[model samples]
Target chain A: PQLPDFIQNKIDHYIENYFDINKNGKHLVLGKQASPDDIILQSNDYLALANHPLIKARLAKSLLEMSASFLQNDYDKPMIEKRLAKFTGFDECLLSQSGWNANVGLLQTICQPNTNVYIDFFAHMSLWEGARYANAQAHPFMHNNCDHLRMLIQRHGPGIIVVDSIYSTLGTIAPLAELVNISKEFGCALLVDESHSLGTHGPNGAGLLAELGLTREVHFMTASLAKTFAYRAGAIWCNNEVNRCVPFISYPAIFSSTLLPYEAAGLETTLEIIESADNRRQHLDRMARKLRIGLSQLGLTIRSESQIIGLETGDERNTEKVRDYLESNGVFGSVFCRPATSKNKNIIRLSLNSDVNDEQIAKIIEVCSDAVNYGDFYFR
Target chain B: PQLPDFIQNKIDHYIENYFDINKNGKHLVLGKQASPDDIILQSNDYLALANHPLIKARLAKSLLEEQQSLFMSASFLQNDYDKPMIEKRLAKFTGFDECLLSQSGWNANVGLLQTICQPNTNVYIDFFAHMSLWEGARYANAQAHPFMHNNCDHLRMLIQRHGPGIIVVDSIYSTLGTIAPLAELVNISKEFGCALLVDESHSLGTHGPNGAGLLAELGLTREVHFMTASLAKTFAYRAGAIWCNNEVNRCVPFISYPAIFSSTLLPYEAAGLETTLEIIESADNRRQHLDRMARKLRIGLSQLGLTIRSESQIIGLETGDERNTEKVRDYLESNGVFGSVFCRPATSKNKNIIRLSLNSDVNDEQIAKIIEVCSDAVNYGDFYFR
Candidate 1:
């Protein structure tokens, strides 16, 4: 009953290390409240879908239809089911109030104490949390390491292989093709989390699974419609068999507040935009390429091919300094230190959206160049 | 590990016994869709604050403002500390969500697991999944026990029976007023998993510990995932919270699409609801009046002394016939003894709201009339109790 010493120590370290240090700071106001000129990469709106006219219109429509009575019980079933299926290429989709709810619910329903789950080490914490909740045994392989994954599956036997198509922090794409083949060979069901990749990567933005032509082989896919769709809520997409088993069994889906109509509407429109506008995807890739190249020219270490670019900021203190410098120079990116990033490897992550223009990209490059210079001169 | 054949058999039996046997051709359309006339006990808006003019005004104003950034990170300072501060005050006042975001009470249950657990760990589950919590634990994929509801001895035996897992139960019984023996259950769970998840869904805005629910009264506040009453009975706002040790690291606050995805738009309205909660707490006059009325109603029922009229706001009395439930429901509606009806038990739990819920606006004469009518129905209503 006593608190485990290691867990207590970790908590003590987190509070004393991060909270105490960060609590005293005067928080800087970053940029001009993030204007069109500001190339804000921390925003998770990967497709620039938040401010899209179609999405706004859809949101407006949904707001009108929603009522307090429509809180938990599944309403607008057909509409949501159709939209989710279309968006994820799953045979069926069930909507939940948030992506966490969807993922947690799905995992709980599928995996029990008897379930064996093999996961990529870098798989989002939710998957790990889900595995914990189900009382399933989880073996985590190194991030993006297919051989490690194959070894894990061989040892674990039949289990769910959970991986994110695009890692949120590092912007690295998963080796989906190799992972899928290994999963097939090992008789493991592949669960892909396309939260970051769906609206930004792959052919038609079906995500890396589609781009790699391994869509059919993946057993279940769960995503936050909010990320690329720039809306709130999450979805669970899988083949009909999984669908049949999931709805009745999944706890979060059955228990939590139903997705707001507005989120569903926004996602519905975002999907339409993704399907029709090849140009947006083109524009996003262009911006990603431009930003990647520009950052490289600035002599910054960049990670992964996707839109998200992670700049390693070495130690915790230095990452804070670089983050502070970026804020001062009118650039904003997500600061990943400590737990979000690996221990001692702090990263300032820039998640690029389609709306970021070349001018903004250049501005970002200028700010980063200045920050790196300042960081080197001041700290190094 | 191989599936526990006994547990699987229990599940199969439960499905066959409850789900299959209870399947009927005619489903009771409990109430017309938010019909004004349908004695609104099923409606979770206990104080009927959802449509309060001030609450509505704030909601409308927020919609117009329509800031795309509806939610900032809970830890972020740009959003006033007031959002969570008010939530903490509300929790302190009611006795929960003191440390975490008051999202939806259901989210509180789910989020608590994610925040507290490591991978492939387990948490015990109550048998009757109150859709929100069941989903939350399921989402976490934590090991669970659908333990018999309110059976504390069963829970204690099960704690020794099963391996360590967080024990979960609701404080105020949602479907029935069969209160779980909180002290005993928490003691056993502490002995077992060393943690308890007590949901005060039906209790918080109404029951013990200065309306903090049974846990605070029983002094189990610091020992469990303190999650309870949001939007429904507490305040007509959207929120829930996870209260735990400020220093536990068994779980990571993983930012999933939900945590990272949704806008923080509702926090403003949630803040406003905090004011309403303050009023509910300081105003012991309301509690006294509610208690007085509930006691009187219970006494009156005891005078008629129906077999099922237990000592609670929810007084269940047998009607002895299924069709009689419909008849009595219609009669109560006509007479204004407009509490809820539970047909399955051939009984109805009289939720004493008319007298218990005084707005400082209602007259004593009206209260007397409600008591008179309720008594009349219990004694003379055409439901074959004998």
Candidate 2:
């Protein structure tokens, strides 16, 4: 098919500018892990649930009991139901294999080409992809600007509003209260993505809407079980009415294989941990605060409210240099350049977990500080 | 943001004719196991690897070791590198997913579209939804089609007429072996979307170039989004790949919460799938032998020239009624054709599976006897020929 010229241009630009043949080979060899001693800060496992003994035991038990037939072939039902109860206090849930699938599936099942969708400029690509697939008209409002959102809603008439509770790249929380109020005033349904906020924020780890006291008001909430909960699945929580429609109608929920039994077992256990493990939450909060204070003390531009800290490296060139320097020194943070981040404004994103001790944090800060100093010497 | 009138019409038609809310509920509850007595024909586990003892033992070992880390974190360097080698090898052998991650092929497509596509666009969808592709398109919310299955002309017309869209289809016919002319579809789709999403669910471990699938054989691996079988049919494994250009780098690796928050504890067994896939090339002779036997059976039925011997691995002897399908199926089971039957006829328009597969293990005499009995049954029964 004839690709959009702009998309093709972007592809060309990426290949010319960022295509690392050497790193690609390294990526293949590295498999999916960071190099053994590569002090990586990119992981989203805030509580380090993957290695938890209790979580492991539950997963083992489930694997032993169910083998592959965990939800009896209807794979999407159980986790969806469980997650809905956990995240939204909803009666029903629908689970898809990934958060991408859930977002896309829900959009496809509900909206069509004629359906208008007002999306935040900073909404994740999954939601944008879904709106595209549904052939819905998507209006991108200014990032976290409720006035812009209100104008778009007025112009579009009525549709769904897609926003992330915490913007993954910028590390800024969405103005959930204002967005929800505007959405309600305009008679638009609200769809909040709690990918970054679920396990880290809100009362009992319920995410943004729960924190904003608008869980019931939001029409649908989808989240990645992989983020704060540190699992490998995606969930959709809507009212019982939307839930009943989505499981059967959404292609992802129906066609994609359901979460393996072991995953459901892990999630069930993780939910319990989130409910009772107050200490982990406190640790995460403390780490976030400490990291923020440290980065600010170092005279770095830290744009974040939660555990994710984004250090502004001024422009793309500086960002690239700083990232390469940090990686060389054994500090690995997510380098957000163009596309993932806007042009010129590059970010070195540091995601924290409870497992990261003060020493590791110090190492990370030291590396960033050194990289900035070296980058200034070499390029400034 | 306008969908084609024809696509909308087709959806409406299917809704009106085939989709009954009550019947759907019944099908969900009462549909017999795709195979009777759990002796499956509908399942793709042709080698019966799902419960292989070694495979189960390996899974137990992984569960003992890491438990939930089986679901590796998506951030590039979080888990151990060895964790994804099994998936990487499977992809390499299949000629895809050089940058492998742990997501189902379903998620792969969803990820691909979300990364690659923009809003208010068209994605040419196949007439049949095998679940994953349907979900992928729905999630992308791309304008899609339910084009006539395996008909290149229909696809060409759809592409030429639609302006811009990604043409999507399957490799081996999942419900039947009516092979798609992928090369032709790719050529047509290129004029429009250039992108193809081929779900190799049924054919991945078995058909096409060295069992790499039709896209690999056709050398369209780089041009298309190659989503292939992960749930092992020949050996026990659960993994899938989303093969594409480095352009996938543009896509964000959204940590699959279900995968992360959940357990991917099948580490040893999932790792062992590498061994099973290594054995796939050796199984080529078995695949060839099955092909020969199937051809022989088709010829035998033709010589006796029974009118209903099908052209694929699945042979369907049209047993006019669904009730007759059960009765004849029971008789065959008793006589040990040990074959299957299909009752619902969305595609075939007849109830059959007269005799589906003849494994490499089935000898010449056994094949002859099976054919002879089928011929006799056809003549004895009150059935019509196509």
Candidate 3:
């Protein structure tokens, strides 16, 4: 059968615009495979708990007695819900299959047609898509700009305010205390995505909201357990009303397969490890701080306040050039362009892990410093 | 801070209309917990491989090895050695040109429709289709025209009225357990210059030679534009796959929202699924046993004059309306026979059922036990509906 013109065009456009134009015949997101010598920094495993002995042991043991049934009747979920709610200092928590579904389901349940959704320009794509899914009018404010947020909320009556607690691409932190106050002032719900900050910040890594003592003040908080927790699941922290209503109403929750019995068991152990993972959090923070200072000394534009550090080059070509330079030099980073970032505001993001030692961090700095001769791709 | 009035209103609506009015105070979808002696027919593990010793050993061994979570988006792994090998294995098993793995069956349907359907595209979806397909149409900004459930004439009429675009249906309906007339639908789609996407979530491991799926069983695999399935059902894993041509496969990772946004499956999961594919390809006895169990239950229920609304292992006792479904489901659970309840979004409003998802592990005695319980429940109250 012949494909539709629009469908064929989309596939053609991706090939012509991205693959054909690329020197390596790969998309901007794809990079050279990393070797053993490479100090890889592209992973979201910030705490490096993916291979932790306790987590793996519990998971492996659970596999032996795992029930293969996909019926997600409150088997172990209710127990995990209690643990997560207490751990995050929330009244109740809802678990989704992934962070993307968590955000999407939350917005779908809360936002109605004609509801004005104030979003951050540099927020995660899931948030933007969530608002779109709700048919809510989305208003993107400048990244971390309180004035723009206030103006948009004031102009539009009052609706939902969505922002990431920490931006994923630039590694910039959201001013939560101010955003919370603004949300209260405007009579709007505040949804803070803690995907990048959940297990790396706060008291016992509860998240940025808990760290700043605003856990009770915010209306909603979401996180992808894939990060830090090293599990492919998402969590939404909200009040009891939202919790009771979402499972029946949200399409993702209703339609998608729930966390399997073994997966829920794995998360139970993962949460325990994350709650007591203070030393790993501290080491991760120190590495991030050291990278910021080292990269700043080299006059590299560093916008990250958390573990996610981004070297902001002006355009896509420069982003790719710097990425290739780092990868070729055995220092790898993630490329953020187009939908992940604004058209020209491309970045080569470096995610710090607790497993990364000082020697590798120094090597990364040295390699980055030497890349200055390769191009004038420093942050403007 | 208080939630917005609108947010509070939605919660209040669910509580007032659904929860408050219910005799049990529990929604139709929520059921009573099963006891140790309960014969569970609610699970989607038709082939009963979730606790397979070999599959468990593979996963346990992988966990002990260097394998851990691949905590990154799939967009970055365009050339990963781990994924493509498994993708090819699934492609060959399902008789597709190529395949792409997703986070869940939900992601596969959502990502495919989101990428293909545009604002001007006409999406003709089955009324009983999975919610993820509708969501994909919504995400693509396409207005989904839902036709009557499994009515080929209704589908044809809608396509003719609105012109042709894309036709989406489940090869086997999840809640009703009815199979799609794939050859007829494929012929209609071809006649109308429309593409067809079939979701085989419920039938992938319980039908066809080597359990390729219902489409392959009907010899319509190559005729369909797309095929998607949730491995959670038959393979007993938490993942989904989209099977299509090589050209469309290359386009999806760069285009689909779920593909670009969601993290890929962990390497250990891919390894376990790989082992499962090999097992499923040769597990003809398990498939046969599963069919026998479903057929026996359906025949046994039919003999009792109860409505049997299934053609596969996923059998539904069509007890109409939410209250009746609750009554029927509760009676079965109290009798130590557990089945899943479906209402509202999973089914049309007030059109509900007690879904008895049969597995290969269910023996003849257990099947007779379920029939006995269902017969007693039918005698207990006006629970059975046509």
Candidate 4:
């Protein structure tokens, strides 16, 4: 039978325009890489490590020995793993192909018949995907509402609570200490997704959990190295036995191909530098604070308590106007409207990288404030 | 809580011995790159294209333009340009209306199962299918009926008894190196109301004249509902892909799902794959060279009174015990031949086998040395060679 016209039409549309030119949705799909001239206020490339000289050099060196399987048995891999294990306060750590796969592997192995799983209302897509594959009943609570999580824990005797260290859409740090306390009391396992908060927090830049001294309390940790670290990969750090389950039972971890040598080497180098990245991390905090202050002074209400600053523009139309204003003038930030966030909350999200100079930051601040005034008439 | 001893022992064992030096009745955990002089038989670097001048050149070029993105809208995205370009070429070449590039071939397969199969749907599988196929089926939560290896008659009998639903098989089986007769399989599947899904991982680049894959070789590309391959084999790069139709657009995993969150291929890998795809169609001479060497190896092994299959690239010689397989692997490794061994879960219980995977990059002299070293490895065990 012929495929329906609706599907065909969409496929054709994709064939015609493969990707949107603008790097928006708060930099989720920066259809292209960043250039030196552009002031990147919304990109997730926070530390600028993806394009660092060391990262490029690693890529160049890796071309010479691009073999895959040798990683698990190699010196650098374990060395990096051991260091990450120490930094994250885990017994062991392993690399995954992507952040999604890291969470997928963790949930696939840990969500068992005897234990129920609880997720945040705004958990990343991979968390939902992993829960599905786990074949266990999973429930979601209100966004970081510890009381709701506690109620669910009360309902399901044995439970596992999964939440991100920082909400990517809102750019808010999770209440790690509160959630961990509740989980420990309820005897529920806590899995913290450190994807967003890893390279920008803590003394060693471990993550929010490590910074809060709650690493010992969290049962499992999953991260996307591509986010703030180096290269393109994910990771799972867990207790010793759960770590064993990955290689033994998890489908993607054992059956999938290895991380390329250059990519893995790039990550090892990132770890070596992350210990000394306190300066960069501190600088990012200052930039974020400055941007937030600038936006506030411009009469924009910022909801997030972390590096992610946003101006709530209730309707999609208002956000669209703001986005168009920014894009036309060579300034772009993530637009969080409808499904990307909540139905009512459409926001213009800004996250500045450590690489942003004072001049660039000032320019970005001015552009964003102008975008607001230009967009004000559209906002209800 | 402390980990139980079963898990602890295994972790201890891994730390003690990082890799299995002998590729015996097991998988390749190639801890380090093979030395300059070593013969690379166990390596998955087929076509030696992983280190080819073309591949290296692409990497060097990518370094200058090294930038990462979610692959879609960065102020500037790097590899995204080449990604869709290569994706379109592959979709057209394979006769797939649409294609979704995934991270690893395993991902490509796993995601297909998750999307295509609804729960409680019956699934018919090739008993000797690659581990990934079995895994996808298991994860789909489908009731799996693993048909006997290549036994279409058994497949039919099971279909009659069980009422067929979905049938999956490999175009060319991995360990045993035998073709599935996909045309006939497609016919049987159509008759039994079973949709056919083929894993052409082994046969994609080296099989057909156009090097599209086995389904393409047999003119069953259109008949196949789904097809997946790890480009690392033929493309000898770092990615996997699924070839499907327009219906998948509205599916659970979006076309640009991974790119929506994380990264996809690097610029060099994407560019290298595009270049490889263009040249793969004209590599029949190289394929024939590999085929000729494979045929010679199988014939010579069969003469040694070992059960062997005459096929292209992968030639399996059955060696029953784990000890003998390990010994044979060590013997050949000592003589600079690195062959993969299959036993247990990778194969049926107790059927220990040594797999000699061939590629065009290997020369005639290397083939002869392989045949000689293999014969000596088997004979040395019988003779108790000092």
Please rank every candidate by lDDT, starting with the best. 3, 4, 2, 1
Tell me which of candidates 1 and 4 scores higher on lDDT. 4
- CAPRI rating of model 3: medium
Q: Tens digit of lDDT per residue, candidate 3, span B62-154?
A: 777984436988988877564557898889888889899998898898888877877888999998888889878977889689998889999
Each prediction's DockQ against the real complex: 0.13, 0.15, 0.58, 0.27
The true-versus-predicted C-alpha distance at residue B170 of model 3, in Å, is: 1.0
Chain B, TM-score, each prediction? 0.69, 0.72, 0.94, 0.84
The DockQ ranking, best first, is 3, 4, 2, 1
- How close to the true structure is residue B362 of candidate 4, measured as C-alpha lDDT? 86
**Model number with the top DockQ:** 3
As a whole number from 0 to 100, the lDDT of residue B15 in candidate 3 is 85
- Evaluate residue A260 in candidate 2 and report its C-alpha lDDT on the 0 to 100 scale: 57
Model 3, stretches more than 4 Å misplaced? A1-6, A66-76, A376-379, B67-69, B80-84, B376-380
Please give me the total number of clashing residue pairs in predicted model 1: 22
Screening candidate 3 with a backbone cut-off below 3 angstroms (N, C-alpha, C), the clashing residue pairs are none
For A1-380, candidate 1 gives per-residue lDDT tens digits of 34433234445664565545652432221112445554456667776655566655565445443112123234425475676576556677777656665677678766768577888777776787788767888888888988787776677677777888888778888888887777677667778899888867666677777777777777788887657766556778876344543444455543334544444556667777876667878888888888888788777777668888888877766666677677667777776654555657777778777777788888888877777576442322
Model 2 in CAPRI terms: which quality? Answer: incorrect
Model 3 scores a C-alpha lDDT of: 0.84
Top-scoring candidate (TM-score) = 3
Residue A338 in candidate 1, Cα distance off native in Å? 3.4
Better of 3 and 4 by DockQ: 3
TM-score of chain A of each: 0.86, 0.85, 0.95, 0.85
Every model's TM-score? 0.69, 0.72, 0.95, 0.79
